[PDB]
Amino acid sequence: RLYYGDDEKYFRKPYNFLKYHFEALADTGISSEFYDNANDLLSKVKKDK
């Protein structure tokens, strides 16, 4: 048998805690952004006389 043990099942709550409350939540947020610019100019004149 593969089975689950139970020792951890309860804790005593110290007097100073009005509430202790196990609750599983997760949140994730991801933001990712790219901006790129390439700007390029060439200009030329040849004048022959």
Add this chain to the structure above:
Amino acid sequence: ISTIQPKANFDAQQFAGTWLLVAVGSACRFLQEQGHRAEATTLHVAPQGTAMAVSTFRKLDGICWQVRQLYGDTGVLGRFLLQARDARGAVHVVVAETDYQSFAVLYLERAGQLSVKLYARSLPVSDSVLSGFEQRVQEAHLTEDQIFYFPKYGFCEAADQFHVLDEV
């Protein structure tokens, strides 16, 4: 209760490698209670000095699991102890009988609570071997009503990194 005689000159190197569990005889409730879903199991076995590492593989709800254990030697050939890892108490082990290439009957006992397990290299087992196992059970004072089999198929290997109990 006594430590029965092992395989004569037990060769851990030959007993090494892959074994499939075939059947278990035990008074342990949880083979008769909830005796359904006797999920198939297999061992990889390696010597590690006189001790042996064992990887049991199993399914659990279809998740493949690996349990790795050291069978510590008793200081005696073919006689081992498993540690009280979870305060389970130590489990005595004897390699009672084996053809290293074919079959093994292993004795395991804790607190007089006794089990014998028949492993094979092979899908079939010789019916003479199975019969020997039956008499091993009777000699252990266990009933035929305490013999339980395991399915021919659905053995697992190489459980995931997250599904290895690694008790040691």
